[PDB]
From TrEMBL:
It holds the Pfam family MLTR_LBD. PROSITE patterns: HTH_CROC1 (PS50943). Residues 26-72 form the HTH cro/C1-type domain. This is Helix-turn-helix domain protein. It comes from Chloroflexus aurantiacus (strain ATCC 29366 / DSM 635 / J-10-fl). The lineage of its organism: Bacteria, Bacillati, Chloroflexota, Chloroflexia, Chloroflexales. It comes from the Bacteria. One of its GO terms (molecular function) is DNA binding.
Amino acid sequence: GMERAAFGKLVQALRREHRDEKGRVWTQEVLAERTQLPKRTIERIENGSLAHLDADILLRLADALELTIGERREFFFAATGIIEQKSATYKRSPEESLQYLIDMIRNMNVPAFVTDQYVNIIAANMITIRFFNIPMELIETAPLLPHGYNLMRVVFGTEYDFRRVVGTMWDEVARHNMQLFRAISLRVRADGYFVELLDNLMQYREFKRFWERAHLETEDTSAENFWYQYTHPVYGLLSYVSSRSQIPTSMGLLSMHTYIPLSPATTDLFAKLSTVANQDVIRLAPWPRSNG
Ligand SMILES: CCCCCCCCCCCCCC(=O)O
Ligand SMILES: [Cl-]
């Protein structure tokens, strides 16, 4: 769950991601109109001065804001989730939590990487780098861009041609990654850094295209594994499943992404890539991003 003021700032950020029929940013009046609610109610929700948020209001807001199935789930929980009297306790500190995920992906002989609350890539083992054949210059120049290490920059960016790698599977893979991005980021949409991140991602024509279409999907894949099956332009026929595990920290969530091989040729490819040089993890986006 969330405090009323934080939830209010979330509604404001979600509203401001929209443009009406005349291309204007949605005002409180427009959100009021689309939800058939009084402007004062939208005003009180956004200021966090409304103690109780009933189901009709929340459903009207989720419907008007055209949230994805994954976003609806996160949005409703941010509004109705019971906050405990005692603050959450964690076995490991944020630093020990990331180090624990790094120590684990270092020991895997399959591609594995870590993302945070903005879906920025925090760390990756060298098997991931070798598998995706990421130019080392693109890693070197990622600190110079606000969206430089974002998973959406890899999938939808112009510098690395991910569409070429997955080929005919592009629509499916881009749809799934858009669903993941939108459901994971839902809780941090009012963050100044997220607003900046979204504006940079919106400069990519293909990101915008999949973003505006995302709510039309009737099937949710954001909380599920994706089974990749395609002819890779250089590795040939591959078959593998990507899994995402989440861990909570006092500085926001951490996600671990792993790719399990599902064919002898994919098994052999991952085994060859784990052999090359040795087991190592490359540090990418700094974490926590704003450590305080
Ligand atoms: C350019 C900065 C990031 C450098 C390395 C990132 C490695 C992560 C690869 C991400 C591709 C995953 C997308 C997918 O499987 O659908
Ligand atoms: Cl390649």
